[PDB]
């Protein structure tokens, strides 16, 4: 199976004019990266409501992943779930983004682009979606086997899965943000992978990356440590090869040089008093 190349891109998806759009929509920036990392309980409400819609929109465009199906019509499907429970995709218009979720197939890290590209049998593809409803976004990402997909590959999948879990496992108030990525990288690393650097968790909430930053590796020097009403997303990105990545000509499509193939997974995660609480959850 070979490496990917560059589909077609279908023509920009309407959404109708009543439900909101991101002040970024339209504009080569978004004014984010200084919103507070703590929410108030108004906003934590509204980020389950905006959650539990990705959380749809996730599934529904996951259970159209076949060999045969594009990942323009995963794109249409996650587009489709968005806009009919009244919420805007954040990815759409977001930095000039052309597409309402990243679809990232076999060696693309992330930030695939939704296109013609025909999934084969034994890929594997991840979809990300996040949806604006309320003032504020909701993220979650699942990579998603299409047909007889190879040991190595579903192996890879179920680690990353599992990693994943075990981060969100950890999220409790007063333990340090630096927690996640150590279990997450020492997950990884027992079973040979290796954990994306250069692609990072965020924090998450009237802005869609509000500045927070989440690391998937091991980095001590993060200082922050976790308070209740935080909100922020674990989206590891596990790769079997090396580390080195290419960006395509699109100024998004992110790939592995080795093209050896990578997975991930993400939920958008609520410190509570005393623990987690995903947000995201289906
Ligand atoms: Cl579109
Ligand atoms: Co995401
Ligand atoms: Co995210
Ligand atoms: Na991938």
Same mark, same amino acid.
């Given at each position: 199976r070979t490496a990917l190349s560059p589909g077609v891109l279908s023509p920009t998806r309407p959404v109708p004019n009543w439900i909101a759009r991101p002040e970024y929509v339209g504009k080569p920036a978004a004014q984010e990266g200084s919103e507070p990392w703590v929410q108030t309980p108004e906003v934590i409400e509204k980020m389950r409501v905006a959650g539990r819609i990705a959380a749809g929109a996730l599934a529904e465009a996951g259970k159209a992943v076949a060999p045969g199906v594009t990942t323009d019509e995963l794109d249409r499907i996650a587009h489709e779930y968005l806009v009919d429970n009244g919420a805007y995709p954040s990815t759409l218009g977001y930095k000039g983004f052309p597409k309402s979720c990243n679809t990232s197939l076999n060696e693309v890290i992330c930030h695939g682009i939704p296109d013609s590209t025909v999934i084969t049998d034994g890929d594997i @593809?991840? &979809?990300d979606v996040t949806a604006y409803i309320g003032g504020v976004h909701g993220d979650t990402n699942a990579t998603? =086997? !299409?047909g007889d997909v !190879?040991? *190595?590959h579903r192996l890879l999948v179920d680690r990353t899965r599992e990693a994943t879990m075990r981060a969100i496992n950890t999220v409790k108030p007063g333990r340090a943000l630096s927690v996640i990525g150590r279990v997450i990288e020492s997950y990884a690393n027992r079973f040979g992978y290796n954990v994306v650097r250069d692609f990072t968790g965020h924090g998450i909430g009237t802005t869609f990356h509000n500045?927070? @930053?989440v690391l998937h590796y091991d980095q001590p020097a993060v200082e922050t440590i976790m308070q209740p009403g935080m909100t922020f997303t674990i989206e =590891?990105? &596990?790769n079997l090869g090396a580390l080195d990545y290419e960006i395509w000509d699109d100024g998004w499509t992110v790939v592995t040089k080795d093209r050896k193939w990578t997975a991930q997974f993400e939920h958008t995660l609520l410190v509570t008093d005393t623990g @987690? *609480? &995903?947000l995201? !959850?289906?």
């Open positions: @593809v991840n &979809i998603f =086997p !299409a !190879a040991d *190595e500045g927070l @930053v =590891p990105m &596990i @987690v *609480e &995903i995201t !959850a289906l």
